[PDB]
Design a protein around this ligand. Structure first.
Ligand SMILES: Nc1ncnc2c1ncn2[C@@H]1O[C@H](COP(=O)(O)OP(=O)(O)OP(=O)(O)O)[C@@H](O)[C@H]1O
Ligand SMILES: [Mg+2]
Lengths: 654, 81
C-alpha cells in the first residue's frame, strides 16, 4: 500500500542519526526513534504499527536512498537495518498474546535461555543436475527448511542445496520470560521465545533484563491442528532495561516518610520486630536476616578486582523450628527475591546449565535462581539437597559472584550477584551439640566458609520458651492484634530496604575501624597454641574479618547513615560473638568451617591414631582416647581408608 | 484427650519422641546409629558394647546398607563409608 509514498515520506523525514551513522564506518545499524517520528509524522507511525513487514523494508530503502544520493555516500550499499527502539506501549510477557501477531510490539522481560550463533540461510539458491540453477527461495530464520517439489524451468526433480551461492547470516535464539522477583504477585511465568539476527546476535546474556521490540511472527508446526501453533518474536531491536523499570518505584512523599522513619528512634529494633512477626523469638536470626537484606556496599578497586558486598546467611536447624516460614516472609519482604527449594525439578535450578532444546536439539544455556536474581536475593530452602552439578559452581557464584560455564560449546561468564539466604537441615535428622557443625551437614566443609552468618535454629525443651511460643501461637491463631501487626508495614519496609540498597552507600570511620581492629587482635592469638601446636586452633581469619566489615556496613545502611559509626561495628561484633557462641564450633573457638574438624580434640587425635584390637588396646594404654574415643577413631579411619579390613579383626592402613 | 489417646494407641516411643516425623526413636535408636558409625567383628564389638541385640544390630547395619552409610567391603566385612 503506497510503498513509494512511504519511501518518500521516510526520505523527507530522515537526520542526526544518519549523520552519526555516516561518521563511523564499521557501524551499520541505525537506531530510529519512535518519538521523533511522532513529533514529525504520526501517520507514518500508525502505518508502521499497522503492517511492519512493508514498513521496515520501505524505510530501509528510503534510508539507503538518503545515504546514496546526498553526499557522504558509502561506496558499498551495506545493509542498514532499521532499529526502532521506542513504542508508545511497553507490553509484558504475561500481557503478550495472539492479538499482537504481525504487529510491531515492545515486550520487556528477562532472558533465561540463550543459543549459539548459527549460519542460517537467507536466500537459498537451489541447484539441480539439469537446468534451473538461478532459482532462489527467501527462507525464514524461525521456520524450517523448505524443498521445492519440482523445478518450473525444465520439470526436473533432482533438487539440491547450493551452499556456495547461499547467503548465510548469524542466527541466535533466546527465551524472554517475565521477571520473577520483580513481578511475583501474578505468578504467571508464561514466556515467548525470540530470535536475533546478524546485527542483534550475541547482544545479551541469560539473566539480564532487556527491552526487546520486534515483529511478532509465527511458525507452522504440523497438520495436527488447523490453526497456527507457536509464535516466535522476530526481534528488531534489543536494549537493556533502565535503572528504574527493573527496580521498585518511589514517590517524593514516600522518600520523605522513609527519611522520617530513618529519623525515628530504635529503627533497628523496629526493623527486627517487623521481619516475620508470626514466628516468636529468633531475634538474633531476624537481626542477621535484616543485616543480610541491607547488604554492604559493593566497591570496585581501580586494580580490577571487585570487593564482595553480599552477606549470605545459612539457617541450620532441626525440623519444626519454623525455619521455612522465615524464608517465606522475607521472600515477599525483600525487594528482589526468588523463593526456591533445594529439590528443584528444573534442569538448572540454581546454577546455569547447557541442555538440549526442543526446536532443533541445539545446546542452549539456561539460567537458574542464582542468575535470574541478579542484584537481589535468592532464598534457597533445603540448601543441603543439591545435585552434584550444582555443588561444583556455587563455590564460585558466592566468592567470585560469577558463573563461568563453557560446556557444550557455550562459553559464558555469568554474574551471580545474589544474596543467598539459605536454610539447611542435618543429614542425621537432628543436630547434636556434642559434634561439630559440618560433621552433620550435607554441605561440603569449604562451602560453610562462604556464609557470613550461620545461625543454629536448635530447639530446646525449656519450660519458659515452650510456654512463650505456645502463648504466641495461640495468640496468632486467635487473631490477636499486636501479634501480626509489625511496627513497619510490609510495603513501606520493602520500599525502605530498596531505598537503602539504592541510595545509601556508607563508608567506614576511624572509630569503627579502630573497634574492628581491637576485636580482631583480641580474637587473634586466642589460645591458638593451646593443646595444638601443629594445628593451632584458629579463632578468626581474614575472611571473617571481611564478613564483619560487611555486617558493620550493613548496620549503618539499615538506619540510613553514610558513615559506619562505632555503634554499627559494636552491633556487628556482638552478632558475630552470639553466632560463634550458639554454634559451639570448637572448645577454644577453632574455625572448623574450613576443615570440619577441631585441631585440638579431632585433628590431633586423628594423627596420633592413624590390626584392630591390638591397635585400640595400644591407643587405650597410651592415652589417645577412651573406649568410645578409640571406637570413633577406628570408625573414622575405616571410612577414610586408614582402618580398612583385609581380614577379620584387622584395621590396617592403606 | 484425643491427642493423648492418639500418642498412646500408637506408642511412638518409650519416652514420647515424635516418631511420626523422625522414624528413629532418638532415645536409644538414633544414638546407637552414631555408635555404629568386619561384619563378624562389628557384631562382636556391638555384643560387648550392648548397644543392641544380635537381631537388632543386624537390622541396624542392613538398613544402613540401603542408604549406603555402612557398606559391605568383602565377604563377611562391614565398614562405614
Ligand atoms: N517461634 C515460633 N513462633 C511461631 N510458630 C512457630 C515457632 N517455632 C515453630 N513454629 C511453628 O512450627 C511449624 C513448622 O514450621 P515450618 O514448617 O514453617 O518450618 P520448619 O518446621 O522449621 O521446617 P522443617 O520442619 O522442615 O525444619 C509452623 O507451623 C510454625 O508456626
Ligand atoms: Mg520445611
Amino acid at each position: 500500500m503506497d510503498r513509494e509514498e512511504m519511501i518518500a515520506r521516510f526520505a523527507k523525514f530522515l537526520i542526526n542519526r544518519l549523520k552519526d551513522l555516516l561518521t563511523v564506518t564499521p557501524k551499520r545499524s541505525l537506531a530510529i526513534d519512535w518519538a521523533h517520528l511522532n513529533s514529525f509524522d504520526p501517520e507514518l507511525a500508525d502505518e508502521l504499527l499497522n503492517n511492519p513487514e512493508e514498513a521496515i523494508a520501505s524505510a530501509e530503502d528510503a534510508i539507503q536512498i538518503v545515504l546514496r544520493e546526498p553526499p557522504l555516500l558509502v561506496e558499498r550499499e551495506f545493509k542498514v537495518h532499521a532499529r526502532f527502539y521506542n513504542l508508545p506501549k511497553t507490553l509484558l510477557v504475561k500481557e503478550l498474546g495472539s492479538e499482537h501477531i504481525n504487529k510491531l510490539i515492545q515486550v520487556e522481560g528477562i532472558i533465561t535461555r540463550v543459543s549459539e550463533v548459527k549460519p542460517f540461510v537467507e536466500k537459498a539458491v537451489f541447484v539441480c543436475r539439469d537446468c534451473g540453477n538461478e532459482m532462489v527461495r527467501l527462507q525464514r530464520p524461525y521456520e524450517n527448511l523448505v524443498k521445492p517439489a519440482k523445478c518450473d524451468a525444465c520439470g526436473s526433480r533432482n533438487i539440491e542445496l547450493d551452499v556456495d551461492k547461499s547467503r548465510f547470516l548469524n542466527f541466535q535464539s533466546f527465551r524472554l520470560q517475565d521477571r520473577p522477583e520483580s513481578l511475583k504477585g501474578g505468578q504467571m511465568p508464561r514466556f515467548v521465545d525470540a530470535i536475533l539476527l546478524d546485527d542483534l546476535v550475541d547482544a545479551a546474556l541469560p539473566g539480564d533484563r532487556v527491552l526487546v521490540t520486534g515483529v511478532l511472527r509465527v511458525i507452522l508446526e504440523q497438520r495436527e491442528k488447523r490453526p497456527i501453533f507457536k509464535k516466535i518474536l522476530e526481534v528488531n531491536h534489543i536494549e537493556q532495561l533502565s535503572k528504574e523499570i527493573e527496580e521498585l518505584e518511589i514517590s517524593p512523599e514516600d522518600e520523605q516518610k522513609i527519611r522520617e522513619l530513618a529519623k525515628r528512634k530504635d529503627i533497628v529494633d523496629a526493623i527486627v520486630d517487623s521481619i516475620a512477626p508470626a514466628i516468636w523469638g529468633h531475634r538474633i536470626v531476624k537481626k542477621g536476616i535484616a543485616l543480610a537484606l541491607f547488604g554492604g556496599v559493593q566497591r570496585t578497586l581501580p586494580d580490577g578486582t571487585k570487593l564482595r558486598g553480599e552477606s549470605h546467611v545459612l539457617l541450620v536447624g532441626d525440623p519444626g523450628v519454623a525455619k521455612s516460614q522465615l524464608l517465606r516472609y522475607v521472600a515477599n519482604l525483600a525487594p528482589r527475591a526468588i523463593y526456591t527449594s533445594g529439590k528443584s525439578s528444573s534442569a538448572a535450578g540454581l546454577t546455569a546449565a547447557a541442555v538440549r532444546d526442543e526446536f532443533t536439539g541445539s545446546w542452549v544455556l539456561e539460567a537458574g535462581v542464582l542468575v535470574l536474581a541478579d542484584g537481589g536475593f535468592a532464598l534457597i530452602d533445603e540448601f543441603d539437597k543439591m545435585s552434584d552439578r550444582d555443588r561444583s559452581a556455587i563455590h564460585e557464584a558466592l566468592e567470585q559472584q560469577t558463573i563461568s560455564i563453557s560446556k557444550a560449546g557455550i562459553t559464558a561468564t555469568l554474574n551471580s550477584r545474589t544474596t543467598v539466604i539459605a536454610a539447611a537441615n542435618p543429614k542425621f535428622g537432628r543436630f547434636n551439640r556434642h559434634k561439630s557443625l559440618p560433621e552433620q551437614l550435607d554441605l561440603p566443609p569449604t562451602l560453610l566458609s562462604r556464609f557470613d552468618l550461620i545461625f543454629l535454629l536448635l530447639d530446646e525443651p525449656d519450660e519458659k520458651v515452650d510456654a512463650s511460643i505456645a502463648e504466641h501461637i495461640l495468640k496468632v491463631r486467635r487473631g490477636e492484634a499486636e501479634a501480626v501487626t509489625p511496627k513497619i508495614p510490609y510495603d513501606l519496609l520493602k520500599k525502605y530496604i530498596a531505598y537503602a540498597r539504592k541510595n545509601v552507600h556508607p563508608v567506614l570511620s576511624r572509630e569503627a575501624m579502630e573497634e574492628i581492629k581491637r576485636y580482631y587482635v583480641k580474637m587473634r592469638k586466642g589460645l591458638r597454641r593451646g593443646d595444638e601446636d601443629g594445628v593451632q586452633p584458629i579463632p578468626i581469619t581474614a575472611r571473617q574479618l571481611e564478613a564483619l566489615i560487611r555486617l558493620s556496613e550493613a548496620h549503618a545502611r539499615m538506619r540510613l547513615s553514610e558513615t559506619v559509626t562505632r555503634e554499627d561495628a559494636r552491633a556487628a561484633i556482638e552478632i558475630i560473638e552470639a553466632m560463634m557462641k550458639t554454634i559451639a564450633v570448637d572448645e577454644e573457638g577453632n574455625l572448623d568451617v574450613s576443615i570440619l574438624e577441631v585441631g585440638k580434640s579431632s585433628k590431633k587425635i586423628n594423627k596420633i591414631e592413624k590390626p584392630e584390637e591390638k591397635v585400640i588396646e595400644a591407643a587405650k594404654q597410651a592415652g589417645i582416647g577412651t573406649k568410645a574415643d578409640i571406637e570413633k577413631l577406628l570408625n573414622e579411619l575405616k571410612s577414610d581408608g586408614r582402618v580398612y579390613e583385609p581380614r577379620a579383626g584387622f584395621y590396617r592402613v592403606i
